[PDB]
Amino acid sequence: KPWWEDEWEVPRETLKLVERLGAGQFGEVWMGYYNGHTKVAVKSLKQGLAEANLMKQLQHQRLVRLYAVVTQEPIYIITEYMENGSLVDFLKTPSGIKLTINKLLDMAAQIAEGMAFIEERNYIHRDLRAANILVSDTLSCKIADFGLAIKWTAPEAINYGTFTIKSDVWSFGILLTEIVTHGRIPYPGMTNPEVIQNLERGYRMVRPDNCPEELYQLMRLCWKERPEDRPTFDYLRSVLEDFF
Amino acid sequence: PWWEDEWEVPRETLKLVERLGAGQFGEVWMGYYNGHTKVAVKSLKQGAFLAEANLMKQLQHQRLVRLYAVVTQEPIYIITEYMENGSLVDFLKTPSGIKLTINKLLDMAAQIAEGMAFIEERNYIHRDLRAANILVSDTLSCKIADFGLARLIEDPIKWTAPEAINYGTFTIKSDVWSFGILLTEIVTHGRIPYPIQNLEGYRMVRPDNCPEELYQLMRLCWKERPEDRPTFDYLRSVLEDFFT
Ligand SMILES: Cc1ccc(C(=O)Nc2cccc(C(F)(F)F)c2)cc1-c1ccc2nc(N)ncc2c1
Numbered sequence A: 001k002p003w004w005e006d007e008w009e010v011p012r013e014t015l016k017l018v019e020r021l022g023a024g025q026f027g028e029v030w031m032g033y034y035n036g037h038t039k040v041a042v043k044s045l046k047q048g049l050a051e052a053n054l055m056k057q058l059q060h061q062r063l064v065r066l067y068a069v070v071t072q073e074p075i076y077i078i079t080e081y082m083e084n085g086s087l088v089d090f091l092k093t094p095s096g097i098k099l100t101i102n103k104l105l106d107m108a109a110q111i112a113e114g115m116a117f118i119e120e121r122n123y124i125h126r127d128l129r130a131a132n133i134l135v136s137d138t139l140s141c142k143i144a145d146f147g148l149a150i151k152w153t154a155p156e157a158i159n160y161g162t163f164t165i166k167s168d169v170w171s172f173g174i175l176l177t178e179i180v181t182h183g184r185i186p187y188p189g190m191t192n193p194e195v196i197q198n199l200e201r202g203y204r205m206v207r208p209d210n211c212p213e214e215l216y217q218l219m220r221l222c223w224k225e226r227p228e229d230r231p232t233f234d235y236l237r238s239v240l241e242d243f244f
Numbered sequence B: 001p002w003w004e005d006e007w008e009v010p011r012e013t014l015k016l017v018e019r020l021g022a023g024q025f026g027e028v029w030m031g032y033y034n035g036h037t038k039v040a041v042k043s044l045k046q047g048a049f050l051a052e053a054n055l056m057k058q059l060q061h062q063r064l065v066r067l068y069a070v071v072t073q074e075p076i077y078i079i080t081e082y083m084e085n086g087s088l089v090d091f092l093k094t095p096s097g098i099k100l101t102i103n104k105l106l107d108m109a110a111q112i113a114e115g116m117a118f119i120e121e122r123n124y125i126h127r128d129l130r131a132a133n134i135l136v137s138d139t140l141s142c143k144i145a146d147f148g149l150a151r152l153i154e155d156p157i158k159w160t161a162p163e164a165i166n167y168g169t170f171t172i173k174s175d176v177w178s179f180g181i182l183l184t185e186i187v188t189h190g191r192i193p194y195p196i197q198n199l200e201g202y203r204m205v206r207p208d209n210c211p212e213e214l215y216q217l218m219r220l221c222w223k224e225r226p227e228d229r230p231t232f233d234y235l236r237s238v239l240e241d242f243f244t
């Protein structure tokens, strides 16, 4: 209505979905094109939005950038498209398999920086993991959420569905293992029911081979049983950035 | 009347997220209009203010912060565009700040001078001209503003002219003196002036790295007799036609 308002819409006609990147209970994720020549990522939401405003308000160097939206259902949320894809997938590429722990921790630092912002803005991610992290053109990390829906979930969240930023901290610790191992799934050779049963007895993932004991203690801080005992993301970023 | 400009919006459409400042007369916040339009919001304390909004509209110019809308219900809100780089004193400090060359540092000075030149035209008097009140766009362009919130606007010791401090006689010439002071903040990455009332007939020593030609300008700005100071129209030309 007002002349100064940002117009974030585009006609559905201007989009061409080319390759489905993922599918979930609430929709799909595609690689496509806007107006014939601008490559973009599109999240189609199964009909039968607050996400876009959220993305706009979390606009940050460390979070995926919102481009536009299609107002009529199926609702579309358009963003920048990342050639390098998700962190988990990129860590398994030749380029990624070769990254030194120094570079890997810089990426962890970037992630911590973004979560520190999310914490600043009082939001809660709820699905933090390498799979939801996008790698930019310059190999930097950008927080995202596209599972469209566990080994990454805090005990309190598993047992009582109580999610807070401290729960995100737990997930972050798990993410660190994915990072140092170049994409190994957490709890190697352990099924979800086995993970929950071991957590019932205070189990914690063993330190990965090649993971410095110092980094491992950081992880252990993230997995403290009491949510309140876990560190802040501002702390985590600080330690990771000044790690070496 | 059907033809009167529309300029109000329901308060409910605004989400104030980060306070940017506060003074005796209110606060300044970064917020969002209807979810995805980033804006700056001034909330003036209930217990006159709309006169500021009319003034801004009347002074509408490329070099002055752009008014968007207001909330007419007390507390009164004044909504404007949001400048991503904030104030110039802030930006001049950024690493990407003063990594700038006299060339750019000076184009910004000329923009400010252009702004004041218009203020001069419109017979307005700023009275609080300092780098802290200058806003920097995303494209590093500068715009004149006023948000210290310490005085009611109606159509700053180290930046105020002797006659202003002494007899409270503020004029465009007083702003000229302030500009001269503002220039020192520009060649110093926002260093505080006079690294003063009692020395004021003392004058600032040239700053380290400032062009003697850019000093002789500051001195003309700092002439004792207000009428001897140069019109902004003049400062605008010299700041632009600098390296010719
Ligand atoms: C098209 C799209 C739309 C929204 C979001 C997204 O992350 N949404 C979101 C929803 C809630 C909260 C967040 C937060 F906070 F993490 F930023 C983010 C992500 C994507 C998206 C999914 C997959 C992708 N793959 C590749 N290779 N490039 C880009 C994308 C972008």
Ligand SMILES: Cc1ccc(C(=O)Nc2cccc(C(F)(F)F)c2)cc1-c1ccc2nc(N)ncc2c1
Residues within 6 Å of the ligand: B020, B028, B040, B041, B042, B052, B055, B056, B059, B064, B065, B078, B079, B080, B081, B082, B083, B084, B085, B086, B087, B119, B126, B135, B144, B145, B146, B147, B153
């Ligand atoms: C929300 C707001 C309302 C009014 C004025 C303002 O400058 N008003 C004004 C009052 C008197 C005279 C003038 C003049 F001369 F500049 F036009 C201007 C400024 C602002 C304002 C404060 C802080 C900000 N920070 C950032 N990062 N972006 C934008 C703003 C806008």
